């Protein structure tokens, strides 16, 4: 498998569990520190990063009823400059740039207790596909599906429904949506970390997925596996292979990686493209830092970059 070794330029450091890199509608960059703890208890943070200086500013330290969150994944909304954050203790949060937030769901559409989330992906229709590797949200005792298969998948629809679309995953992690050229969502890809697998489904409609299938295989026998993911403008899927020192590159059809990207660290966690560029910002857990490197092409436009009132 061809392996490229681009130059990684340091962005910022010392972010415990450095995760969920994201750009908002203004081009501002955000990172979440899920593993920040105070006295041994969760006290995760959502930070804004000045790309010019690398200086960190924590805008939100989410907590509901004394229970601190473990914010791990992000997506920027389109109709409003706000962030949808997957939290391992609080579920789905909507965080404003001013630092204020709101917990989206205590229970799903079936009245079942919500599970802690890790990452999410907006389809062009506005539906948010979320991975829930943890057990029930706070105040429930913290649990995560690294060893047992109780991880779930949700779809938070445009009409405000938190619908559980599947379960029994061994730590569902990164997630991405494949769209047709005309913009129609048609395939959901989900990473199952420890199993070294990437799963896929046919998106039949909002919160409607069918035909679960092992779409791709993650290299290595190291502890870890597929973490964060995203598509480039050509629909190639870059996946951070946590613990492998590489970011895997899958073709439109999946299977085995058609290329790998060597990182100057062992634990790449998540990644995100800077709008209108080839620049990929990468978070990693070896040094708990953020880096950036140039990819061969631009990224696939995020839902937040699309237009509600566009013509084409
Ligand atoms: Ca993740
Ligand atoms: Ca991303």
Swiss-Prot record:
Gene3D superfamilies, per database record: TolB, C-terminal domain
Outcome, altering residue 35 to Q: 50% decrease in activity
Active site: 285
Gene Ontology MF terms: calcium ion binding; diisopropyl-fluorophosphatase activity
Consequence when changing residue 75 to W: No effect on activity
Biotechnology: Has potential application in bio-remediation by detoxification of organo-phosphates used in insecticides or nerve agents used in chemical warfare such as soman, tabun and sarin.
Alphabetically ordered keywords of this record: Calcium, Hydrolase, Metal-binding
EC numbers: 3.8.2.2
Consequence of substituting residue 285 to L: 21% decrease in activity
Amino acids binding Ca(2+) 1: 19, 118, 173, 227
Keyword Metal-binding: yes
Cross-referenced InterPro entries: 6-blade_b-propeller_TolB-like (IPR011042), SGL (IPR013658), SMP-30/CGR1_Lactonase (IPR051262)
SUPFAM superfamilies: Calcium-dependent phosphotriesterase (SSF63829)
Superkingdom classification of source: Eukaryota
Effect noted on mutating residue 235 to S: 4% decrease in activity
Ligand binding (Ca(2+) 2): 230, 271-272
Cofactor detail note: Binds 2 calcium ions per subunit.
Effect of residue 179 to N: 20% decrease in activity
Activity regulation text: Inhibited by chelating agents.
Pfam family, one: SGL
Function: Biological function and substrate unknown. However, it is capable of acting on phosphorus anhydride bonds (such as phosphorus-halide and phosphorus-cyanide) in organophosphorus compounds (including nerve gases).
Subunit and interaction comment: Monomer.
Protein name: Diisopropyl-fluorophosphatase
Origin species: Loligo vulgaris (Common European squid)
